Amino acid sequence: HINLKVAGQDGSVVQFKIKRHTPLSKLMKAYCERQGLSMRQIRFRFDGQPINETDTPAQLEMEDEDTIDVFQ
Amino acid sequence: HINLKVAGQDGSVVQFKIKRHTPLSKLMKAYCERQGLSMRQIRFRFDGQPINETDTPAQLEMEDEDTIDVFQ
Amino acid sequence: HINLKVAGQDGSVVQFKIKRHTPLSKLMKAYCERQGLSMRQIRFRFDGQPINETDTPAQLEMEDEDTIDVFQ
């Protein structure tokens, strides 16, 4: 697994672990469930690029302790 | 204190700090309270072994930044 | 940004990132919102000193991976 941070605009940082070839939608759904948020209302980006349903950490060239940004 | 991670099957990783000779039930109860979960429905394991009410990090040979796995 | 930990008496550790010259009330409000807590009922301290509305990490001489303590 690699460890990823999900950072909100409020400064909150929530941690996940995910395998490099697993879709990031695993993480996005878990974030929403754990944080009581809706995909209808939030968006996830990595180094400015939107993350799609099937993108994986390896495809997006993510490394351990990288950060995903969440926006409204 | 040592720092411990509690990892769910969804990839969520939640952090605790606990003294080495304090029972892990402190951590288990705090996890349940903070995550809105019930002991009735979840179980905690460390390197495949169930964690009991009075087990301590020192007894289970846990070290800083180790991970506890949570299951349904 | 620097990374800060917010530690509860239950051993929970929640992470934030904040710029050094931004008021810590950003973090305090985010903690309360994310944790479903009220400022009416909790207090934040750093190395024994209460944190006020306009105190910044730089003013309080905080560094990456320092811990803020939360109390009832």
Coordinates of N, CA and C in Angstrom, one line a residue:
Chain A
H1 N 0.8 -1.2 0.0 CA 0.0 0.0 0.0 C 0.9 1.2 0.0
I2 N 0.3 2.3 -0.5 CA 0.9 3.6 -0.2 C -0.1 4.4 0.6
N3 N 0.5 5.3 1.4 CA -0.3 6.2 2.3 C -0.6 7.5 1.5
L4 N -1.8 7.9 1.6 CA -2.2 9.2 0.9 C -2.9 10.0 1.9
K5 N -2.8 11.3 1.8 CA -3.5 12.3 2.6 C -4.6 12.9 1.7
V6 N -5.7 13.2 2.3 CA -6.8 13.9 1.6 C -7.0 15.2 2.4
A7 N -6.7 16.4 1.8 CA -6.7 17.7 2.5 C -7.8 18.5 2.0
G8 N -8.6 19.0 3.0 CA -9.7 19.9 2.7 C -9.2 21.3 2.8
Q9 N -10.1 22.2 2.3 CA -9.7 23.6 2.3 C -9.7 24.2 3.7
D10 N -10.3 23.6 4.7 CA -10.3 24.0 6.1 C -9.0 23.5 6.7
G11 N -8.1 22.9 6.1 CA -6.9 22.4 6.7 C -6.9 21.0 7.2
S12 N -8.1 20.4 7.2 CA -8.2 19.0 7.7 C -7.4 18.1 6.8
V13 N -6.7 17.1 7.4 CA -6.0 16.1 6.6 C -6.4 14.7 7.1
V14 N -6.9 13.9 6.2 CA -7.4 12.6 6.6 C -6.6 11.6 5.8
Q15 N -6.2 10.5 6.4 CA -5.3 9.5 5.8 C -6.0 8.3 5.3
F16 N -5.5 7.8 4.2 CA -5.9 6.5 3.6 C -4.7 5.7 3.2
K17 N -4.8 4.4 3.0 CA -3.8 3.6 2.4 C -4.5 2.9 1.3
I18 N -3.8 2.7 0.2 CA -4.3 2.2 -1.1 C -3.2 1.5 -1.9
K19 N -3.5 0.4 -2.5 CA -2.5 -0.2 -3.4 C -2.4 0.6 -4.7
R20 N -1.2 0.5 -5.3 CA -0.9 1.4 -6.4 C -1.8 1.2 -7.6
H21 N -2.3 0.0 -7.8 CA -3.1 -0.3 -9.0 C -4.6 -0.5 -8.7
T22 N -5.0 0.0 -7.5 CA -6.4 0.0 -7.2 C -7.0 1.4 -7.5
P23 N -8.2 1.4 -8.1 CA -8.8 2.7 -8.4 C -9.0 3.6 -7.2
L24 N -8.7 4.8 -7.4 CA -8.9 5.9 -6.4 C -10.3 6.1 -6.0
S25 N -11.3 5.7 -6.8 CA -12.7 5.7 -6.4 C -12.9 4.9 -5.1
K26 N -12.1 3.9 -4.8 CA -12.1 3.2 -3.5 C -12.0 4.3 -2.3
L27 N -10.9 5.1 -2.5 CA -10.6 6.1 -1.5 C -11.6 7.2 -1.5
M28 N -12.1 7.7 -2.7 CA -13.1 8.7 -2.7 C -14.4 8.3 -2.0
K29 N -14.8 7.1 -2.3 CA -16.0 6.7 -1.6 C -15.8 6.5 -0.1
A30 N -14.7 6.0 0.3 CA -14.4 5.9 1.7 C -14.3 7.2 2.4
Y31 N -13.7 8.2 1.8 CA -13.7 9.6 2.4 C -15.0 10.1 2.6
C32 N -15.9 10.0 1.5 CA -17.2 10.5 1.6 C -18.0 9.8 2.8
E33 N -17.9 8.5 2.9 CA -18.6 7.8 3.9 C -18.1 8.1 5.3
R34 N -16.8 8.2 5.5 CA -16.2 8.5 6.8 C -16.5 9.9 7.2
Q35 N -16.5 10.9 6.3 CA -16.6 12.3 6.6 C -18.0 12.8 6.5
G36 N -19.0 11.9 6.2 CA -20.4 12.3 6.1 C -20.6 13.3 4.9
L37 N -19.9 13.2 3.8 CA -20.0 14.0 2.6 C -20.6 13.2 1.5
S38 N -21.0 14.0 0.5 CA -21.5 13.5 -0.7 C -20.7 13.8 -2.0
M39 N -20.6 12.8 -2.9 CA -19.9 13.0 -4.1 C -20.7 14.1 -4.9
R40 N -21.9 14.3 -4.6 CA -22.7 15.3 -5.4 C -22.0 16.7 -5.2
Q41 N -21.4 16.9 -4.0 CA -21.0 18.2 -3.6 C -19.5 18.4 -3.5
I42 N -18.7 17.3 -3.6 CA -17.2 17.5 -3.5 C -16.6 16.9 -4.8
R43 N -15.3 17.4 -5.0 CA -14.5 17.0 -6.1 C -13.1 16.8 -5.6
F44 N -12.4 15.8 -6.2 CA -11.0 15.5 -5.8 C -10.0 15.8 -6.9
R45 N -8.9 16.4 -6.6 CA -7.9 16.7 -7.5 C -6.5 16.2 -7.0
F46 N -5.6 15.9 -7.9 CA -4.2 15.6 -7.6 C -3.3 16.4 -8.5
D47 N -2.5 17.3 -7.9 CA -1.7 18.2 -8.7 C -2.4 18.8 -9.8
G48 N -3.6 19.3 -9.5 CA -4.5 20.1 -10.3 C -5.3 19.4 -11.3
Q49 N -5.2 18.0 -11.3 CA -6.0 17.3 -12.3 C -7.1 16.6 -11.6
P50 N -8.3 16.6 -12.2 CA -9.4 15.9 -11.6 C -9.1 14.4 -11.6
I51 N -9.6 13.7 -10.5 CA -9.4 12.3 -10.5 C -10.7 11.6 -10.9
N52 N -10.7 10.7 -11.9 CA -11.8 10.0 -12.4 C -11.9 8.6 -11.8
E53 N -13.1 8.0 -12.0 CA -13.5 6.8 -11.3 C -12.5 5.6 -11.4
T54 N -11.8 5.5 -12.5 CA -10.9 4.4 -12.6 C -9.4 4.8 -12.5
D55 N -9.1 6.0 -12.3 CA -7.7 6.4 -12.2 C -7.1 5.7 -10.9
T56 N -5.9 5.2 -11.1 CA -5.2 4.6 -10.0 C -4.0 5.5 -9.5
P57 N -3.5 5.2 -8.3 CA -2.3 6.0 -7.9 C -1.2 5.8 -8.9
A58 N -0.9 4.7 -9.4 CA 0.2 4.5 -10.3 C 0.0 5.3 -11.6
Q59 N -1.2 5.3 -12.1 CA -1.5 6.1 -13.3 C -1.2 7.6 -13.1
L60 N -1.6 8.0 -11.9 CA -1.4 9.5 -11.6 C -0.1 9.7 -11.0
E61 N 0.8 8.8 -10.9 CA 2.2 9.0 -10.5 C 2.3 9.5 -9.0
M62 N 1.4 8.9 -8.2 CA 1.4 9.2 -6.8 C 2.4 8.4 -6.1
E63 N 2.9 9.0 -5.0 CA 3.9 8.3 -4.1 C 3.4 8.4 -2.7
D64 N 4.0 7.5 -1.9 CA 3.7 7.5 -0.4 C 3.8 8.9 0.1
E65 N 2.7 9.3 0.9 CA 2.6 10.6 1.6 C 2.2 11.7 0.7
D66 N 1.9 11.4 -0.6 CA 1.3 12.5 -1.4 C -0.1 12.9 -0.9
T67 N -0.5 14.1 -1.3 CA -1.8 14.7 -0.9 C -2.7 14.9 -2.1
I68 N -4.0 14.5 -1.9 CA -5.1 14.7 -2.7 C -5.9 15.9 -2.1
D69 N -6.3 16.9 -3.0 CA -7.0 18.0 -2.6 C -8.5 17.8 -2.8
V70 N -9.3 18.1 -1.8 CA -10.8 18.1 -2.0 C -11.4 19.5 -1.9
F71 N -12.3 19.7 -2.9 CA -13.0 21.0 -3.0 C -14.5 20.7 -3.1
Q72 N -15.2 21.8 -2.8 CA -16.7 21.9 -2.9 C -17.1 22.1 -4.4
Chain B
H1 N 4.2 8.0 24.8 CA 3.2 7.4 24.0 C 3.8 6.8 22.8
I2 N 3.2 5.8 22.2 CA 3.5 5.4 20.8 C 2.2 5.7 20.0
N3 N 2.5 6.0 18.7 CA 1.5 6.3 17.7 C 1.1 5.0 17.0
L4 N -0.2 4.8 16.9 CA -0.7 3.6 16.3 C -1.8 4.1 15.2
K5 N -1.8 3.3 14.2 CA -2.8 3.5 13.1 C -3.9 2.4 13.3
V6 N -5.1 2.8 13.0 CA -6.2 1.8 12.9 C -6.7 1.9 11.5
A7 N -6.6 0.8 10.7 CA -6.9 0.7 9.3 C -8.1 -0.1 9.0
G8 N -9.1 0.5 8.4 CA -10.2 -0.2 7.9 C -10.1 -0.8 6.6
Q9 N -11.0 -1.8 6.3 CA -10.9 -2.4 5.0 C -11.2 -1.5 3.8
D10 N -11.8 -0.3 4.0 CA -12.0 0.7 3.1 C -10.8 1.5 2.8
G11 N -9.7 1.2 3.5 CA -8.5 2.0 3.3 C -8.3 3.2 4.3
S12 N -9.4 3.5 5.0 CA -9.2 4.6 6.0 C -8.2 4.2 7.1
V13 N -7.4 5.2 7.5 CA -6.4 5.1 8.5 C -6.6 6.2 9.5
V14 N -6.9 5.9 10.7 CA -7.1 6.8 11.8 C -6.1 6.6 12.8
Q15 N -5.6 7.7 13.5 CA -4.4 7.7 14.3 C -4.8 7.8 15.8
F16 N -4.1 7.2 16.6 CA -4.2 7.2 18.1 C -2.8 7.3 18.6
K17 N -2.7 7.8 19.9 CA -1.5 7.7 20.7 C -1.9 7.0 22.0
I18 N -1.0 6.1 22.5 CA -1.3 5.3 23.6 C 0.0 5.0 24.3
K19 N 0.0 5.0 25.6 CA 1.2 4.5 26.4 C 1.3 3.0 26.3
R20 N 2.5 2.5 26.4 CA 2.8 1.1 26.1 C 2.2 0.2 27.1
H21 N 1.9 0.6 28.3 CA 1.4 -0.3 29.3 C -0.1 0.0 29.6
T22 N -0.8 0.8 28.8 CA -2.2 1.1 28.9 C -3.0 0.1 28.0
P23 N -4.1 -0.4 28.5 CA -4.9 -1.4 27.7 C -5.4 -0.8 26.5
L24 N -5.3 -1.6 25.4 CA -5.8 -1.2 24.1 C -7.3 -1.0 24.0
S25 N -8.0 -1.5 25.0 CA -9.5 -1.1 25.1 C -9.7 0.4 25.2
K26 N -8.7 1.2 25.7 CA -8.8 2.6 25.6 C -9.0 3.1 24.2
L27 N -8.1 2.6 23.3 CA -8.1 2.9 21.9 C -9.3 2.4 21.2
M28 N -9.7 1.1 21.5 CA -10.8 0.5 20.8 C -12.1 1.3 21.1
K29 N -12.3 1.7 22.3 CA -13.5 2.5 22.7 C -13.4 3.8 22.0
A30 N -12.3 4.5 22.0 CA -12.1 5.8 21.4 C -12.4 5.8 19.9
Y31 N -11.9 4.7 19.2 CA -12.2 4.5 17.8 C -13.6 4.4 17.5
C32 N -14.3 3.6 18.3 CA -15.7 3.4 18.1 C -16.5 4.7 18.3
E33 N -16.2 5.4 19.4 CA -16.8 6.7 19.7 C -16.6 7.7 18.6
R34 N -15.3 7.9 18.1 CA -15.0 8.9 17.2 C -15.6 8.5 15.8
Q35 N -15.7 7.3 15.4 CA -16.1 6.8 14.1 C -17.6 6.5 14.0
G36 N -18.3 6.6 15.1 CA -19.7 6.3 15.2 C -20.0 4.8 14.9
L37 N -19.1 3.9 15.4 CA -19.2 2.5 15.3 C -19.5 1.8 16.6
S38 N -19.9 0.6 16.5 CA -20.2 -0.2 17.7 C -19.3 -1.4 17.9
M39 N -18.9 -1.7 19.1 CA -18.1 -2.9 19.4 C -19.0 -4.1 19.0
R40 N -20.3 -4.0 18.9 CA -21.1 -5.1 18.6 C -20.7 -5.6 17.2
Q41 N -20.3 -4.7 16.3 CA -20.2 -5.0 14.9 C -18.7 -5.0 14.4
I42 N -17.8 -4.6 15.2 CA -16.4 -4.5 14.6 C -15.5 -5.3 15.6
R43 N -14.4 -5.8 15.0 CA -13.3 -6.5 15.7 C -12.0 -5.9 15.3
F44 N -11.0 -5.9 16.3 CA -9.7 -5.4 16.1 C -8.7 -6.5 16.2
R45 N -7.7 -6.5 15.2 CA -6.6 -7.5 15.2 C -5.3 -6.8 15.0
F46 N -4.2 -7.4 15.6 CA -2.9 -7.0 15.4 C -2.0 -8.2 14.9
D47 N -1.5 -8.1 13.7 CA -0.7 -9.2 13.1 C -1.5 -10.5 13.3
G48 N -2.8 -10.4 13.0 CA -3.6 -11.6 12.9 C -4.2 -12.1 14.2
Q49 N -3.9 -11.4 15.3 CA -4.3 -11.9 16.6 C -5.4 -11.0 17.1
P50 N -6.5 -11.5 17.6 CA -7.5 -10.7 18.2 C -6.9 -9.9 19.4
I51 N -7.4 -8.7 19.5 CA -7.0 -7.9 20.7 C -8.1 -7.9 21.8
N52 N -7.8 -8.4 23.0 CA -8.6 -8.5 24.1 C -8.6 -7.2 25.0
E53 N -9.6 -7.2 25.9 CA -9.8 -6.0 26.7 C -8.6 -5.4 27.5
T54 N -7.8 -6.3 27.9 CA -6.7 -5.9 28.8 C -5.4 -6.0 28.1
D55 N -5.3 -6.4 26.8 CA -4.0 -6.4 26.2 C -3.4 -5.0 26.0
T56 N -2.2 -4.9 26.2 CA -1.5 -3.6 26.1 C -0.6 -3.6 24.8
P57 N -0.2 -2.5 24.3 CA 0.8 -2.4 23.2 C 2.1 -3.2 23.6
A58 N 2.6 -3.1 24.8 CA 3.8 -3.8 25.1 C 3.6 -5.3 25.1
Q59 N 2.5 -5.8 25.6 CA 2.2 -7.2 25.6 C 2.2 -7.8 24.2
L60 N 1.6 -6.9 23.3 CA 1.5 -7.4 21.9 C 2.7 -6.9 21.0
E61 N 3.7 -6.4 21.6 CA 5.0 -6.1 21.0 C 4.8 -5.1 19.8
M62 N 3.9 -4.1 20.1 CA 3.6 -3.1 19.2 C 4.7 -2.0 19.3
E63 N 5.0 -1.3 18.2 CA 5.9 -0.2 18.1 C 5.3 1.0 17.4
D64 N 5.9 2.1 17.7 CA 5.5 3.4 17.0 C 5.2 3.1 15.5
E65 N 4.0 3.6 15.1 CA 3.6 3.6 13.7 C 3.1 2.2 13.2
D66 N 3.0 1.3 14.2 CA 2.3 0.1 13.8 C 0.8 0.3 13.5
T67 N 0.2 -0.7 12.8 CA -1.2 -0.7 12.4 C -2.0 -1.8 13.0
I68 N -3.1 -1.5 13.5 CA -4.2 -2.3 14.0 C -5.2 -2.4 12.9
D69 N -5.7 -3.6 12.5 CA -6.7 -3.8 11.5 C -8.0 -4.0 12.1
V70 N -9.0 -3.3 11.6 CA -10.4 -3.4 12.0 C -11.2 -4.1 10.9
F71 N -12.1 -5.0 11.4 CA -13.0 -5.8 10.6 C -14.4 -5.7 11.1
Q72 N -15.3 -6.0 10.2 CA -16.7 -6.2 10.5 C -17.0 -7.5 11.2
Chain C
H1 N 2.9 25.1 4.4 CA 2.1 24.7 5.5 C 2.9 23.9 6.5
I2 N 2.5 23.9 7.7 CA 3.1 22.8 8.6 C 1.9 22.0 9.1
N3 N 2.3 20.8 9.4 CA 1.4 19.7 9.8 C 1.3 19.7 11.3
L4 N 0.1 19.7 11.9 CA -0.1 19.7 13.3 C -1.1 18.6 13.6
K5 N -0.9 18.0 14.8 CA -1.7 17.0 15.4 C -2.6 17.7 16.4
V6 N -3.8 17.2 16.6 CA -4.7 17.6 17.6 C -5.1 16.3 18.4
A7 N -4.6 16.2 19.6 CA -4.7 15.0 20.5 C -5.8 15.2 21.5
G8 N -6.7 14.3 21.6 CA -7.7 14.3 22.6 C -7.2 13.4 23.8
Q9 N -7.9 13.6 24.9 CA -7.6 12.8 26.1 C -7.9 11.3 25.9
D10 N -8.7 10.9 25.0 CA -9.0 9.6 24.6 C -7.9 8.9 23.8
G11 N -6.9 9.7 23.4 CA -5.8 9.2 22.6 C -6.0 9.4 21.1
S12 N -7.2 9.9 20.7 CA -7.4 10.3 19.3 C -6.4 11.3 18.8
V13 N -5.9 11.2 17.6 CA -5.0 12.2 17.0 C -5.5 12.5 15.6
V14 N -5.9 13.7 15.4 CA -6.4 14.2 14.1 C -5.5 15.2 13.6
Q15 N -5.3 15.2 12.3 CA -4.2 16.0 11.6 C -4.9 17.2 10.9
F16 N -4.1 18.2 10.9 CA -4.4 19.5 10.1 C -3.1 19.9 9.5
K17 N -3.2 20.8 8.5 CA -2.1 21.5 7.9 C -2.6 23.0 7.9
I18 N -1.7 23.9 8.3 CA -1.9 25.3 8.4 C -0.6 26.1 8.1
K19 N -0.8 27.2 7.5 CA 0.4 28.1 7.2 C 0.8 28.8 8.5
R20 N 2.0 29.1 8.6 CA 2.6 29.6 9.9 C 2.1 30.9 10.4
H21 N 1.6 31.7 9.5 CA 1.1 33.0 9.9 C -0.5 33.1 9.8
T22 N -1.2 32.0 9.7 CA -2.6 31.9 9.7 C -3.1 31.7 11.1
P23 N -4.2 32.3 11.6 CA -4.7 32.1 12.9 C -5.1 30.7 13.1
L24 N -4.7 30.2 14.3 CA -5.1 28.8 14.7 C -6.6 28.6 14.9
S25 N -7.4 29.7 15.0 CA -8.8 29.6 15.0 C -9.3 28.9 13.7
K26 N -8.6 29.0 12.6 CA -9.0 28.2 11.4 C -9.0 26.7 11.7
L27 N -8.0 26.3 12.4 CA -7.8 24.9 12.8 C -8.8 24.5 13.9
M28 N -9.0 25.3 14.9 CA -10.0 25.0 16.0 C -11.4 24.9 15.4
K29 N -11.8 25.8 14.6 CA -13.1 25.7 14.0 C -13.3 24.4 13.1
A30 N -12.2 24.1 12.3 CA -12.3 22.9 11.5 C -12.3 21.6 12.3
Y31 N -11.6 21.6 13.4 CA -11.6 20.5 14.3 C -13.0 20.2 14.9
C32 N -13.6 21.4 15.3 CA -15.0 21.2 15.9 C -16.0 20.8 14.9
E33 N -15.9 21.3 13.7 CA -16.8 21.0 12.6 C -16.6 19.5 12.2
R34 N -15.4 19.1 12.0 CA -15.1 17.7 11.5 C -15.4 16.7 12.6
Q35 N -15.3 17.0 13.9 CA -15.4 16.1 15.0 C -16.8 16.1 15.7
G36 N -17.7 17.0 15.2 CA -19.0 17.2 15.7 C -19.0 17.7 17.2
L37 N -18.0 18.6 17.5 CA -17.9 19.2 18.8 C -18.1 20.7 18.8
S38 N -18.3 21.2 20.0 CA -18.6 22.6 20.2 C -17.5 23.4 20.9
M39 N -17.2 24.6 20.5 CA -16.3 25.4 21.2 C -16.8 25.7 22.6
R40 N -18.1 25.5 22.8 CA -18.6 25.8 24.1 C -18.1 24.8 25.1
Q41 N -17.7 23.7 24.6 CA -17.3 22.6 25.5 C -15.9 22.1 25.5
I42 N -15.1 22.6 24.5 CA -13.7 22.2 24.5 C -12.8 23.4 24.5
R43 N -11.5 23.1 24.9 CA -10.5 24.1 24.9 C -9.2 23.5 24.3
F44 N -8.4 24.3 23.7 CA -7.2 23.9 23.0 C -6.0 24.6 23.7
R45 N -4.9 23.8 23.9 CA -3.7 24.2 24.5 C -2.5 23.8 23.7
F46 N -1.4 24.5 23.8 CA -0.1 24.2 23.2 C 1.0 24.4 24.3
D47 N 1.6 23.3 24.6 CA 2.6 23.3 25.7 C 2.1 24.1 26.9
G48 N 0.9 23.8 27.3 CA 0.3 24.3 28.5 C -0.4 25.7 28.4
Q49 N -0.3 26.3 27.2 CA -0.8 27.7 27.1 C -2.1 27.6 26.3
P50 N -3.1 28.3 26.8 CA -4.3 28.4 26.0 C -4.0 29.0 24.6
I51 N -4.7 28.6 23.6 CA -4.6 29.2 22.3 C -5.8 30.1 22.1
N52 N -5.6 31.4 21.8 CA -6.5 32.4 21.6 C -6.9 32.6 20.1
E53 N -7.9 33.3 19.8 CA -8.5 33.4 18.4 C -7.5 33.8 17.4
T54 N -6.6 34.7 17.7 CA -5.7 35.2 16.7 C -4.3 34.7 16.8
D55 N -4.0 33.8 17.7 CA -2.7 33.2 17.8 C -2.4 32.4 16.6
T56 N -1.1 32.6 16.0 CA -0.7 31.8 14.9 C 0.3 30.8 15.3
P57 N 0.5 29.8 14.5 CA 1.6 28.8 14.8 C 3.0 29.5 15.0
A58 N 3.3 30.5 14.2 CA 4.6 31.2 14.3 C 4.7 31.9 15.6
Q59 N 3.6 32.5 16.1 CA 3.6 33.2 17.4 C 3.8 32.3 18.5
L60 N 3.2 31.1 18.4 CA 3.4 30.1 19.4 C 4.6 29.2 19.2
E61 N 5.4 29.4 18.3 CA 6.6 28.7 18.0 C 6.4 27.2 17.8
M62 N 5.3 27.0 17.0 CA 5.0 25.6 16.6 C 5.8 25.2 15.4
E63 N 6.1 23.9 15.3 CA 6.9 23.3 14.2 C 6.1 22.1 13.6
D64 N 6.5 21.8 12.4 CA 5.9 20.6 11.8 C 5.8 19.4 12.7
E65 N 4.7 18.8 12.8 CA 4.4 17.6 13.6 C 4.3 17.8 15.1
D66 N 4.2 19.1 15.5 CA 3.8 19.4 16.9 C 2.3 19.0 17.1
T67 N 2.0 18.9 18.4 CA 0.7 18.5 18.9 C 0.1 19.6 19.8
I68 N -1.2 19.8 19.5 CA -2.1 20.6 20.2 C -3.0 19.7 21.0
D69 N -3.2 20.0 22.3 CA -4.0 19.2 23.2 C -5.4 19.8 23.3
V70 N -6.4 18.9 23.2 CA -7.8 19.4 23.4 C -8.3 18.8 24.7
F71 N -9.0 19.6 25.5 CA -9.7 19.3 26.7 C -11.1 19.7 26.7
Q72 N -11.9 19.0 27.6 CA -13.2 19.4 27.9 C -13.3 20.6 28.8

